A paper describes a structure:
The spliceosome excises introns from nascent messenger RNA (1) in the form of a lariat containing an unusual 2′,5′-phosphodiester linkage (2). Hydrolysis of this linkage is rate-limiting in lariat degradation after splicing, and is required for efficient maturation of many small nucleolar RNAs (snoRNA) and micro RNAs (mirtrons) that are derived from intronic RNA. Dbr1 is tuned to hydrolyze 2′,5′-phosphodiester RNA linkages in branched RNA and not the considerably more abundant canonical 3′,5′-phosphodiester linkages, although the molecular basis for this selectivity has remained elusive for several decades despite extensive biochemical characterization of the enzyme. Sequence analyses predict Dbr1 consists of an N-terminal domain belonging to the metallophosphoesterase (MPE) superfamily of enzymes and a C-terminal domain (CTD) lacking detectible sequence similarity to any other class of protein.
Author numbering: 5 to 353
The structure:
Protein backbone atom coordinates (compact mmCIF):
# COMPACT_ATOMS: atom_id res chain seq x y z
CA UNK A 1 0.00 0.00 0.00
CA UNK A 2 1.21 3.48 -1.00
CA UNK A 3 0.69 7.20 -0.26
CA UNK A 4 1.32 9.93 -2.84
CA UNK A 5 2.65 13.16 -1.37
CA UNK A 6 2.87 16.31 -3.45
CA UNK A 7 6.01 18.32 -2.71
CA UNK A 8 5.90 21.99 -3.86
CA UNK A 9 8.62 24.66 -3.99
CA UNK A 10 7.91 28.43 -3.96
CA UNK A 11 4.18 29.15 -4.09
CA UNK A 12 4.50 32.96 -4.01
CA UNK A 13 0.76 33.53 -3.63
CA UNK A 14 -0.35 31.48 -6.64
CA UNK A 15 -2.60 29.02 -4.80
CA UNK A 16 -5.39 28.61 -7.39
CA UNK A 17 -2.72 27.73 -9.94
CA UNK A 18 -0.95 25.30 -7.59
CA UNK A 19 -4.15 23.49 -6.74
CA UNK A 20 -5.06 23.41 -10.45
CA UNK A 21 -1.76 21.66 -11.22
CA UNK A 22 -2.28 19.19 -8.37
CA UNK A 23 -5.81 18.41 -9.59
CA UNK A 24 -4.38 17.73 -13.06
CA UNK A 25 -1.94 15.20 -11.62
CA UNK A 26 -4.82 13.34 -10.00
CA UNK A 27 -6.63 13.52 -13.36
CA UNK A 28 -3.85 12.48 -15.75
CA UNK A 29 -2.55 9.69 -13.47
CA UNK A 30 -5.61 8.54 -11.53
CA UNK A 31 -3.48 8.64 -8.38
CA UNK A 32 -4.69 10.03 -5.04
CA UNK A 33 -2.79 12.84 -3.26
CA UNK A 34 -2.69 12.09 0.48
CA UNK A 35 -1.41 15.58 1.30
CA UNK A 36 0.79 18.42 0.11
CA UNK A 37 4.03 19.88 1.43
CA UNK A 38 5.24 23.34 0.41
CA UNK A 39 8.72 24.66 1.05
CA UNK A 40 7.87 28.33 1.54
CA UNK A 41 7.38 31.82 0.12
CA UNK A 42 3.70 31.30 0.88
CA UNK A 43 2.71 34.98 1.16
CA UNK A 44 -0.30 34.32 3.39
CA UNK A 45 -1.56 37.91 3.32
CA UNK A 46 -5.02 38.06 4.92
CA UNK A 47 -5.85 41.56 3.63
CA UNK A 48 -4.26 44.74 2.23
CA UNK A 49 -2.76 45.88 5.51
CA UNK A 50 -0.61 42.73 5.64
CA UNK A 51 1.35 44.00 2.62
CA UNK A 52 3.53 45.99 5.05
CA UNK A 53 5.08 42.72 6.29
CA UNK A 54 5.92 41.22 2.89
CA UNK A 55 9.57 41.86 2.05
CA UNK A 56 9.69 41.90 -1.75
CA UNK A 57 10.89 44.33 -4.37
CA UNK A 58 8.25 46.96 -5.24
CA UNK A 59 7.09 45.13 -8.37
CA UNK A 60 6.07 42.17 -6.21
CA UNK A 61 4.00 44.05 -3.62
CA UNK A 62 0.81 42.15 -4.58
CA UNK A 63 -1.87 40.34 -2.54
CA UNK A 64 -1.76 37.05 -4.41
CA UNK A 65 -4.51 34.44 -3.98
CA UNK A 66 -4.27 33.53 -0.26
CA UNK A 67 -6.90 36.03 0.86
CA UNK A 68 -9.45 34.08 -1.21
CA UNK A 69 -8.79 31.00 0.94
CA UNK A 70 -8.73 33.11 4.12
CA UNK A 71 -12.15 34.58 3.24
CA UNK A 72 -13.50 31.14 2.34
CA UNK A 73 -14.29 32.10 -1.24
CA UNK A 74 -11.88 29.34 -2.29
CA UNK A 75 -11.24 26.10 -0.43
CA UNK A 76 -7.96 24.16 -0.38
CA UNK A 77 -8.77 20.68 -1.76
CA UNK A 78 -5.90 18.93 0.05
CA UNK A 79 -4.31 19.20 3.49
CA UNK A 80 -1.31 21.43 2.82
CA UNK A 81 1.60 21.66 5.29
CA UNK A 82 4.12 24.44 4.95
CA UNK A 83 7.05 26.38 6.37
CA UNK A 84 7.91 30.01 5.80
CA UNK A 85 10.52 31.30 3.40
CA UNK A 86 11.83 34.82 2.76
CA UNK A 87 8.66 36.19 1.09
CA UNK A 88 5.92 35.99 3.73
CA UNK A 89 3.29 37.87 5.63
CA UNK A 90 5.79 37.71 8.47
CA UNK A 91 3.41 39.17 11.06
CA UNK A 92 1.00 36.28 10.50
CA UNK A 93 3.78 33.69 10.85
CA UNK A 94 5.06 35.32 14.06
CA UNK A 95 1.61 35.02 15.70
CA UNK A 96 1.78 31.35 14.67
CA UNK A 97 5.44 30.77 15.57
CA UNK A 98 4.21 27.69 17.45
CA UNK A 99 2.46 26.54 14.28
CA UNK A 100 -1.17 26.89 13.24
CA UNK A 101 -3.76 26.75 10.49
CA UNK A 102 -3.81 29.99 8.43
CA UNK A 103 -7.10 28.84 6.91
CA UNK A 104 -8.92 25.57 6.27
CA UNK A 105 -6.51 22.82 5.13
CA UNK A 106 -3.36 24.96 5.31
CA UNK A 107 -1.14 24.29 8.31
CA UNK A 108 1.99 26.30 9.09
CA UNK A 109 4.62 24.30 10.95
CA UNK A 110 5.88 27.34 12.87
CA UNK A 111 9.43 28.65 13.27
CA UNK A 112 10.30 24.95 13.44
CA UNK A 113 8.57 21.81 14.67
CA UNK A 114 7.91 18.18 13.95
CA UNK A 115 4.48 16.76 13.16
CA UNK A 116 3.05 13.30 12.54
CA UNK A 117 0.84 12.19 9.64
CA UNK A 118 0.15 8.82 8.04
CA UNK A 119 2.94 7.24 10.12
CA UNK A 120 5.53 9.81 9.03
CA UNK A 121 7.51 12.24 11.17
CA UNK A 122 8.03 15.53 9.33
CA UNK A 123 10.34 18.34 10.51
CA UNK A 124 10.14 21.92 9.21
CA UNK A 125 12.68 24.75 9.51
CA UNK A 126 11.35 28.12 8.33
CA UNK A 127 13.26 31.10 6.99
CA UNK A 128 16.52 31.88 5.22
CA UNK A 129 19.95 32.30 6.79
CA UNK A 130 21.67 35.61 7.48
CA UNK A 131 24.56 35.54 9.97
CA UNK A 132 23.79 39.05 11.26
CA UNK A 133 20.33 37.94 12.52
CA UNK A 134 20.92 34.37 13.71
CA UNK A 135 21.21 35.34 17.41
CA UNK A 136 18.43 37.93 17.28
CA UNK A 137 15.34 37.34 19.43
CA UNK A 138 11.81 37.72 18.12
CA UNK A 139 10.00 40.80 19.46
CA UNK A 140 6.25 40.65 19.86
CA UNK A 141 3.87 42.02 18.86
CA UNK A 142 5.22 42.33 15.32
CA UNK A 143 6.41 45.76 14.20
CA UNK A 144 6.71 47.04 10.58
CA UNK A 145 10.37 47.77 11.31
CA UNK A 146 10.95 44.01 11.53
CA UNK A 147 9.78 43.29 7.97
CA UNK A 148 13.44 42.88 7.01
CA UNK A 149 14.44 40.49 9.80
CA UNK A 150 11.43 38.40 10.85
CA UNK A 151 12.07 35.71 8.23
CA UNK A 152 15.74 35.14 8.99
CA UNK A 153 16.33 31.70 10.54
CA UNK A 154 17.58 31.89 14.16
CA UNK A 155 20.36 29.57 15.36
CA UNK A 156 18.33 28.29 18.32
CA UNK A 157 16.25 25.98 16.10
CA UNK A 158 19.32 23.76 16.06
CA UNK A 159 19.05 23.00 19.79
CA UNK A 160 15.25 22.77 19.59
CA UNK A 161 15.38 20.07 16.90
CA UNK A 162 18.67 18.24 17.61
CA UNK A 163 17.27 15.48 19.86
CA UNK A 164 14.30 14.66 17.59
CA UNK A 165 15.79 11.53 15.98
CA UNK A 166 16.53 9.89 19.35
CA UNK A 167 13.49 7.58 19.61
CA UNK A 168 12.67 7.16 15.92
CA UNK A 169 13.90 8.39 12.54
CA UNK A 170 12.75 11.54 10.73
CA UNK A 171 11.01 10.74 7.42
CA UNK A 172 10.96 14.19 5.83
CA UNK A 173 12.60 17.51 6.73
CA UNK A 174 11.64 20.77 5.01
CA UNK A 175 13.58 23.99 4.66
CA UNK A 176 13.43 27.05 2.47
CA UNK A 177 17.07 27.69 1.64
CA UNK A 178 19.30 24.66 0.95
CA UNK A 179 21.48 22.91 3.51
CA UNK A 180 24.93 24.49 3.07
CA UNK A 181 27.36 22.42 0.98
CA UNK A 182 24.79 19.99 -0.38
CA UNK A 183 25.11 21.62 -3.79
CA UNK A 184 28.40 19.68 -4.15
CA UNK A 185 26.62 16.36 -3.53
CA UNK A 186 24.70 16.10 -6.83
CA UNK A 187 25.48 16.79 -10.50
CA UNK A 188 26.65 20.34 -9.84
CA UNK A 189 28.40 20.71 -13.19
CA UNK A 190 25.01 20.23 -14.86
CA UNK A 191 23.34 22.50 -12.30
CA UNK A 192 25.91 25.22 -13.04
CA UNK A 193 25.10 24.96 -16.74
CA UNK A 194 21.44 25.83 -16.14
CA UNK A 195 22.29 28.10 -13.19
CA UNK A 196 25.56 30.00 -13.86
CA UNK A 197 24.88 32.33 -10.91
CA UNK A 198 25.29 29.50 -8.37
CA UNK A 199 28.92 28.79 -9.17
CA UNK A 200 30.43 31.73 -7.26
CA UNK A 201 29.18 30.65 -3.83
CA UNK A 202 30.68 27.19 -4.34
CA UNK A 203 30.17 24.84 -1.39
CA UNK A 204 29.11 27.77 0.81
CA UNK A 205 25.74 28.11 -1.03
CA UNK A 206 22.92 27.55 1.45
CA UNK A 207 22.26 27.66 5.18
CA UNK A 208 24.79 26.46 7.80
CA UNK A 209 21.82 26.00 10.13
CA UNK A 210 20.12 23.57 7.73
CA UNK A 211 23.41 21.86 7.10
CA UNK A 212 23.86 21.14 10.83
CA UNK A 213 20.26 19.94 11.21
CA UNK A 214 20.55 17.60 8.22
CA UNK A 215 23.83 16.19 9.53
CA UNK A 216 22.37 15.76 13.02
CA UNK A 217 19.00 14.19 12.14
CA UNK A 218 19.85 12.45 8.83
CA UNK A 219 16.20 12.37 7.59
CA UNK A 220 15.20 10.08 4.66
CA UNK A 221 14.37 13.16 2.65
CA UNK A 222 15.32 16.81 2.83
CA UNK A 223 13.21 19.07 0.63
CA UNK A 224 14.08 22.71 -0.10
CA UNK A 225 12.74 25.55 -2.26
CA UNK A 226 14.16 29.05 -2.71
CA UNK A 227 16.59 28.37 -5.59
CA UNK A 228 14.11 28.18 -8.53
CA UNK A 229 15.46 24.94 -9.98
CA UNK A 230 15.05 21.24 -9.52
CA UNK A 231 18.08 19.42 -8.13
CA UNK A 232 18.72 16.09 -6.48
CA UNK A 233 21.67 15.14 -4.31
CA UNK A 234 22.58 12.47 -1.79
CA UNK A 235 24.24 13.27 1.53
CA UNK A 236 24.85 9.83 2.98
CA UNK A 237 21.41 8.29 3.73
CA UNK A 238 19.51 11.53 3.05
CA UNK A 239 17.85 12.17 -0.33
CA UNK A 240 17.96 15.90 -1.05
CA UNK A 241 15.38 17.34 -3.43
CA UNK A 242 15.18 21.00 -4.44
CA UNK A 243 12.01 22.31 -6.08
CA UNK A 244 11.43 25.32 -8.31
CA UNK A 245 8.80 28.05 -8.24
CA UNK A 246 5.10 27.67 -9.13
CA UNK A 247 4.47 28.59 -12.76
CA UNK A 248 7.40 26.46 -13.94
CA UNK A 249 7.47 22.68 -14.50
CA UNK A 250 10.03 21.98 -11.76
CA UNK A 251 7.93 23.40 -8.88
CA UNK A 252 5.96 20.26 -8.01
CA UNK A 253 7.06 16.66 -7.55
CA UNK A 254 5.59 13.61 -5.90
CA UNK A 255 6.82 11.22 -3.23
CA UNK A 256 5.50 7.69 -3.47
CA UNK A 257 5.86 6.40 0.08
CA UNK A 258 4.82 3.19 1.85
CA UNK A 259 1.60 3.63 3.80
CA UNK A 260 1.11 1.41 6.86
CA UNK A 261 -1.33 3.58 8.78
CA UNK A 262 -3.61 6.26 7.43
CA UNK A 263 -3.83 8.69 10.37
CA UNK A 264 -4.80 12.32 10.89
CA UNK A 265 -2.34 15.16 11.32
CA UNK A 266 -0.99 15.00 14.88
CA UNK A 267 1.52 16.80 17.08
CA UNK A 268 4.81 14.93 17.48
CA UNK A 269 5.25 13.75 21.06
CA UNK A 270 9.00 14.42 21.18
CA UNK A 271 8.43 17.92 19.79
CA UNK A 272 5.70 18.59 22.35
CA UNK A 273 8.08 17.56 25.15
CA UNK A 274 10.74 19.95 23.84
CA UNK A 275 8.16 22.69 23.58
CA UNK A 276 7.10 22.36 27.23
CA UNK A 277 10.62 21.83 28.64
CA UNK A 278 11.99 24.95 26.91
CA UNK A 279 9.13 27.10 28.20
CA UNK A 280 11.28 29.13 30.67
CA UNK A 281 13.27 30.43 27.67
CA UNK A 282 10.03 31.54 25.99
CA UNK A 283 8.20 32.94 29.04
CA UNK A 284 8.54 36.64 28.08
CA UNK A 285 5.92 37.20 25.35
CA UNK A 286 7.52 40.50 24.32
CA UNK A 287 10.94 39.01 23.50
CA UNK A 288 11.77 35.35 22.86
CA UNK A 289 13.72 33.22 23.22
CA UNK A 290 15.78 34.50 26.15
CA UNK A 291 19.16 32.90 25.47
CA UNK A 292 20.52 33.71 28.91
CA UNK A 293 18.88 30.27 29.16
CA UNK A 294 20.57 27.33 27.51
CA UNK A 295 18.02 25.52 25.31
CA UNK A 296 19.96 22.25 25.46
CA UNK A 297 20.34 22.58 29.24
CA UNK A 298 16.55 22.85 29.56
CA UNK A 299 16.14 19.86 27.24
CA UNK A 300 18.72 17.78 29.18
CA UNK A 301 16.01 17.60 31.88
CA UNK A 302 13.64 15.46 29.78
CA UNK A 303 12.92 12.06 31.33
CA UNK A 304 10.65 9.19 30.31
CA UNK A 305 8.37 9.86 33.30
CA UNK A 306 8.14 13.59 32.59
CA UNK A 307 7.63 13.00 28.86
CA UNK A 308 4.76 10.69 29.80
CA UNK A 309 3.13 13.31 32.05
CA UNK A 310 3.67 16.07 29.48
CA UNK A 311 1.85 14.10 26.74
CA UNK A 312 -0.97 13.26 29.14
CA UNK A 313 -1.45 16.97 29.92
CA UNK A 314 -1.07 18.02 26.27
CA UNK A 315 -3.70 15.52 25.24
CA UNK A 316 -5.95 16.92 27.98
CA UNK A 317 -5.72 20.65 27.20
CA UNK A 318 -4.96 20.70 23.48
CA UNK A 319 -5.39 17.23 22.02
CA UNK A 320 -2.94 15.10 20.05
CA UNK A 321 -4.75 15.83 16.83
CA UNK A 322 -3.93 19.13 15.17
CA UNK A 323 -7.37 20.53 14.47
CA UNK A 324 -8.63 23.60 12.66
CA UNK A 325 -9.07 26.65 14.87
CA UNK A 326 -10.63 29.82 13.35
CA UNK A 327 -9.70 32.28 16.07
CA UNK A 328 -7.61 35.28 15.00
CA UNK A 329 -3.90 34.62 15.01
CA UNK A 330 -3.14 36.96 17.93
CA UNK A 331 -5.60 34.91 20.00
CA UNK A 332 -3.99 31.63 18.90
CA UNK A 333 -0.58 33.01 19.92
CA UNK A 334 -1.78 33.76 23.44
CA UNK A 335 -3.77 30.54 23.74
CA UNK A 336 -1.04 28.08 22.76
CA UNK A 337 1.48 29.79 25.10
CA UNK A 338 -1.12 29.72 27.85
CA UNK A 339 -1.34 25.95 27.71
CA UNK A 340 2.42 25.47 27.28
CA UNK A 341 2.91 27.51 30.46
CA UNK A 342 0.12 25.65 32.29
CA UNK A 343 1.56 22.22 31.46
CA UNK A 344 5.08 23.30 32.40
CA UNK A 345 3.94 24.64 35.77
CA UNK A 346 2.01 21.42 36.45
CA UNK A 347 5.15 19.31 36.11
CA UNK A 348 6.62 21.04 39.21
CA UNK A 349 10.31 21.85 38.75
MN1 LIG B 1 12.61 32.34 -1.55
Amino acid sequence: QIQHIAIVGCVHGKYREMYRQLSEYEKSTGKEISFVICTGDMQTLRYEADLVYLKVPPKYKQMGDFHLYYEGKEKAPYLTLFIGGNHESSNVLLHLYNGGFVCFNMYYLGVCSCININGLRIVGVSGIYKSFDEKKPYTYPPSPNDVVSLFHTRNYVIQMLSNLSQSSQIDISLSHDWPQGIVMKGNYKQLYRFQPGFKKDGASLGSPINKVILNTLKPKYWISGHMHCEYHAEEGPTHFIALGKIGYKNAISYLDLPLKQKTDLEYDKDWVCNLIMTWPAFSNKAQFPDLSYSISELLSKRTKELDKKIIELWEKYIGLKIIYDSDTFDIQFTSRRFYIEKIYNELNI
